[PDB]
């Protein structure tokens, strides 16, 4: 607990990661002012589990984690405990006992292109579901059958990543959304991230 935690770096970053390669910022030894988050009206999703956001300035934690990525709007519902889908199963999984906040806002003006933004990708094939907070960035050919693929595309041998190709669509559910997930860790250790009141 010393200087202020750099939340604006996470939220106002020029570029966001692909969901399959989601970014994580580890926040330690600072004073965290969450008022800039829960007093803003720009967010379309703001859901906290195990904690109320209006109390965050009065709480202390061992560490805080800020995960950021981009997904489709109709996929934001999958960033929640117990959910399923391509994002939750193969790209970014929250734990059942999650303590934190999920914050998402429409980023069509930033991440959409008339010709499509193909810099943003998601994992489409995987042998098994991701464990909570697991990151998988491999590009190995997915083996759909029992025949080894030998790193070559073909029948039952598919590239595992697929691009969103974000465009300025008509339905908001198809547009890109930027997501920040705040995780509040509590261990048997001194607290290093505290709200200004503490």
């Amino acid at each position: 607990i010393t200087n202020l935690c750099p939340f604006g770096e996470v939220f106002n970053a020029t570029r966001f990661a692909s969901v399959y390669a989601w970014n994580r910022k580890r926040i330690s030894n600072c004073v965290a002012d969450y008022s800039v988050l829960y007093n803003s009206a720009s967010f379309s999703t703001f859901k906290c589990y195990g904690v109320s956001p209006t109390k965050l300035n009065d709480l202390c934690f061992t560490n805080v984690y800020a995960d950021s990525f981009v997904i489709r709007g109709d996929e934001v519902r999958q960033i929640a405990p117990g959910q399923t889908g391509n994002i939750a199963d193969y790209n970014y999984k929250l734990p059942d006992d999650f303590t934190g906040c999920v914050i998402a806002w429409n980023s069509n003006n930033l991440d959409s292109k008339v010709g499509g933004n193909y810099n943003y990708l998601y994992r489409l094939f995987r042998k098994s579901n991701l464990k909570p907070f697991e990151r998988d960035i491999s590009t190995e050919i997915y083996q759909a059958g029992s025949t080894p693929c030998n790193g070559v595309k073909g029948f039952n041998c598919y590239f595992p990543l697929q691009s969103y190709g974000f465009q300025p669509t008509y339905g908001v559910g198809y547009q890109p959304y930027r997501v920040v997930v705040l995780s509040f860790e509590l261990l048997h250790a001194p607290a290093t991230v505290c709200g200004p009141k503490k």
Partner: antibody
């Protein structure tokens, strides 16, 4: 009950297009692939091309590349084959085929076949 | 393309004998990417063999497959009257996924 079911027979004037449907049941459609094959009356099987359901990637034989469009509709688990610039040589029976898939695992060959769709093109 | 030559063009044998069908490819094709189909009149192709030696589900033991490289063989031992059909070999490891011309298996009587 695992099956692939195709649309009924079609009559199309030359130069027009025909769209054959192929509905899948009993399978994890999202992990499978669909190949389309044609057989003329008393002739051999002719490979047209295939599609990967999850990605939509397609690969066609050189003869149909400029003329065929293979798609899928995952909200109905139904694949489609569209043939354009219909000529009298296109009068044939068209089959779709797919491997059976358990969620992530898939069979190592096209073991499910549709009943076929007889398409006649003439004036 | 990969050319698939089936041999012979036609095959007449009495029931109870053993039929040997050959399928040859213009270049090598992976064994786990060769298939045998059986097509009866008025019926869709039926997956007989996949992977050049594996029987599809529910296929009787009198159907067998073998071969490698540029030569594959489908053997129908203990031939039965219902086995009159056209048998096709398809490679699906290199685009285009070519078919053989088919072998007409007929029954002597």
């Amino acid at each position: 009950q695992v099956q692939l079911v195709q649309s009924g027979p079609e009559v199309k004037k030359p130069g027009t297009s025909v769209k054959v449907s192929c509905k899948a049941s009993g399978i994890t459609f999202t992990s499978s692939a669909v190949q389309w094959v044609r057989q003329a009356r008393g002739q051999r099987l002719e490979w047209i091309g295939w599609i990967v359901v999850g990605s939509g990637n397609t690969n066609y034989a050189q003869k149909f590349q400029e003329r065929v469009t293979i798609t899928r509709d995952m909200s109905t688990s139904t694949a489609y084959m569209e043939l354009s610039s219909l000529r009298s040589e296109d009068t044939a029976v068209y089959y779709c085929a797919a491997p059976y898939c358990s969620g992530g695992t898939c069979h190592d060959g096209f073991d499910i076949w549709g009943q076929g769709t007889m398409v006649t093109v003439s004036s | 393309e990969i050319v698939l030559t089936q041999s012979p063009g036609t095959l007449s044998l009495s029931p109870g004998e053993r039929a040997t069908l050959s399928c040859r490819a213009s270049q090598s094709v992976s064994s786990s990417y060769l298939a045998w189909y059986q097509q009866k009149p008025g019926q869709a192709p039926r997956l007989l063999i996949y992977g050049a030696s594996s029987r599809a589900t529910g296929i009787p033991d009198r159907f067998s497959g073998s071969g490698s490289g540029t030569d594959f063989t489908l053997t129908i031992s203990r031939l039965e009257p219902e086995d009159f059909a056209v048998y096709y070999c398809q490679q699906y490891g290199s685009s285009p996924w070519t078919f053989g011309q088919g072998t007409k298996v007929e029954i002597k009587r």
